[PDB]
Symmetry: C3
């Protein structure tokens, strides 16, 4: 087909992007989780998210203004708090008693705004809180260079399978994976990789840890050496669903700044390092934009733990009380890359000799 669409959105923290982009004193609209949301900061700078359409007569709160700690609807100026409470009908004798719209719980981590989603309507388990990335604040590192695209005709689950995919590193990312291991446990699914650049594409040695913390947000630590020169990168791979067949895919890059040369040159290099990582990610995007998901895939041993990863991902789409132990218990596997590398080295060699 392949695969009945999910009937709920995933339970978890979803990143909506860089926090400071949701400030500038105004509210902002975001289409997400089958609805429209309004994001706004109160007078203390703390960020809030509500259902976007006013509970009075359907005005678009995202196109209103911020007055104090509330968002004012552009239609009749009703004031809504970050907790969803109707704080004031400015022209009325009586503001409604205990009126509320839906509030979405927020979090700011590493200069990124997150929103909690749960079909069951329960608040975040503190155990799944998205980790701080100290390097974001550190002035030894750049600040987020962020991107976003809308992908249509695809569900967001269609990109999670990359976690278990060893062989695509050769064909898509033009490198030779000499080490590959997955670990799934609780709310975290991880990929550990050693990757060597291909001689036949113009060598680099990459060590990569990448972990999804919950269903939608992956931090990828990139430790690359090109001879003796080490470089350090952190890449965010994240998304949020718009509908069950469209989603917003976002990536953000920071790099350790080279220490030290002219400020002007440090910038020039850091731009190259960043752009490089982004082109790496864009290689995956191109495949994601031009593929379908296969629910009943044809698999070889080298595919690794496709079924187990998907089983892990299922935990976010069932009620917490129905989470099965096989979704969350520690599972690990190392994929043997030896034979693939012998074959690939031959392909690489054949290509060099050929010119």
């Amino acid at each position: 087909d392949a695969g009945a669409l999910p009937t709920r959105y995933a339970r978890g923290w979803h990143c909506l992007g860089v926090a400071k982009d949701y400030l500038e004193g105004k509210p902002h609209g975001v289409e997400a989780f089958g609805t429209k949301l309004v994001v706004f900061a109160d007078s203390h700078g703390d960020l809030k998210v509500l259902d976007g359409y006013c509970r009075h007569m359907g005005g678009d709160l995202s196109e209103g203004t911020v007055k104090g700690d509330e968002v004012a609807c552009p239609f009749h100026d009703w004031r809504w708090g970050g907790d969803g409470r109707c704080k004031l009908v400015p022209y009325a004798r009586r503001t409604p008693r205990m009126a509320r719209t839906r509030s979405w719980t927020t979090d700011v981590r590493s200069g990124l705004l997150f929103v909690w989603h749960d079909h069951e309507g329960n608040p975040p388990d503190p155990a799944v809180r998205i980790p701080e990335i100290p390097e974001a604040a550190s002035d030894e590192w750049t600040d987020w260079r962020w991107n976003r695209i809308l992908i249509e005709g695809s569900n967001c689950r269609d990109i999670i399978d990359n976690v278990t995919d060893m062989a695509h590193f050769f064909y898509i990312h033009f490198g030779l994976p000499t080490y590959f291991k997955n670990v799934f446990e609780g709310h975290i699914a991880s990929q550990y990789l050693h990757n060597v650049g291909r001689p036949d594409v113009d060598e680099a040695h990459l060590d990569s840890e990448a972990s999804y913390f919950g269903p939608s947000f992956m931090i990828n630590w990139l430790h690359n050496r090109y001879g003796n020169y080490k470089s350090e990168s952190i890449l965010i791979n994240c998304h949020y669903p718009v509908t069950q067949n469209s989603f917003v895919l976002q990536w953000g890059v920071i790099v350790e700044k080279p220490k030290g040369m002219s400020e002007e040159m440090t910038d020039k290099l850091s731009r190259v390092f960043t752009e490089g990582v982004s082109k790496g990610f864009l290689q995956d995007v191109e495949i994601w934009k031009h593929k379908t998901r296969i629910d009943n895939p044809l698999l070889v041993e080298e595919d690794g733990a496709v079924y187990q990863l998907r089983r892990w991902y299922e935990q976010f789409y069932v009620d917490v009380a129905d989470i099965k132990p096989e979704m969350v218990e520690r599972f690990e596997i190392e994929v043997d890359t030896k034979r693939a590398n012998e074959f690939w080295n031959a392909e690489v060699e054949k290509n060099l000799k050929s010119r």
Copy 2:
């Protein structure tokens, strides 16, 4: 959600626009009431409306030509009368006996073309005939300056609620409503308003009567004074449904011509008066294009008769024999604007003082 879509289009007269725009010797296509229609004038200039697709093999009658009193299909030239009768198959030995397509009953009032729609297929109650507006013919007034837009992702019921909306006059139209009363009876729902311009936006005094005559057509008489100079306007607010989630919204303006100065200057002023009224209407459009309808609204006393207006509007979506007395009996209410005006005057004052 909010609100299950209606399962039929409203029973009533719907305006398709300015009659003379449907002449120029040819037929015209209109998408309406979930189908396509053909509009055309016979040899006496009288305007007719049929289902647009030919009952023979599906040719588009709207792209045919007018021959005498019939529209000729562009495919095999069959002739269709304004009453839907198949008058002639030009090349055939025998024209079908008593063949008919669906005819739509028409009316021309005040230089505007109207069409009758009724799910039950009954002809117009003469009691709901759209009133003549003498000012249209009068050469003391301009001629219709008409506009139309297609609004998508909204049902046309989503704009009727403005009738009961006192408070939006301040936030959307930048005036202070010191008088506000609704009257609903039979097929007519009306709003009577006294409105004063806000000092803090750069004063005008407006008296307004606006009545929907049936479900889709509102005439608005605008009696404005700016000091000692009175001006008279008539504004048409009307629509027709295209689908249950798109509709065409149209507005038309005429003004009493200032009497009297140079013909050239009279035109110059009348253009300003007209453009002014249109910008008033466009303020509502902007809200209508950027909102949702709330089926179960959160209401304050100041909202007035939201539920009663909607109940009145329901009469057009039930079979005539099922019209309930509470939809059509006289209902009236005056909304007390005193407190709102004290509050608003304070807001206005605060803004002046602030600069």
Copy 3:
């Protein structure tokens, strides 16, 4: 309505176009029969068609490359044969044993690529094989000048009715049909026509045989004389479904080259002959793009065998074992054009006299 959409695509040979356009050493994507297909030639130049999305993890085979006799998926380079077999996973210890994707049976006739479709999944009856057109190879004739358009909001059955349509030759093609006969038998439905140019449009005498061989592919032999000068044309009218409400309509023209004058002038004329035929076809396209299908048409005697043609066409949408004799037995009819021609000649005369 008119007409419930079909629930399967037609059983038959469908032309995807000119074979050589599907070569140039790469694979090609085609949206058809509700899915996406990949077309590619193996190392012997023989053309193949598979389901377009890889059975592994959903890569787009149409965007891969051809390696030897297989198409290589762009994601993990798996090799797929023209018969759908998984020939090789290049990096794996073991290629899957007896893995297959869906293969589509192909045929090349007259320099055109064809694909077999059958909901029942059975292979082509050799009896319905598309005939060779020797004139394609002959260097006394031009080579295919081919066109294609996507028609949206219409099912492909909506164009088959032209076969039975005598009267449209006057109104759409501006000629006078003095002879008209249909013959339906087995998998072939044909129209034989003698057509005379109208005096009142700026005379030509056309003899035309046009036959659908199966549900989607029509060959039209055009024998035209303009005085003493005969010209010979062959026109292909064909389509394939994309969805049940969109299809690709294609037409191809070849003409007997005038024998003989300068090579340069022979080309100049042949371009005119071709362009002429194409403008003839484009007259039908314009009606097809602007009409609906009528499931329960209003008919006159002159319509001929509308019901019988549709009954013939139904054979392709039922299981072979359920094909009813009345779909496939020989049916023929001649439509009497005499009276229509008297009437038309009068219309023509009236138009000449009028200027």
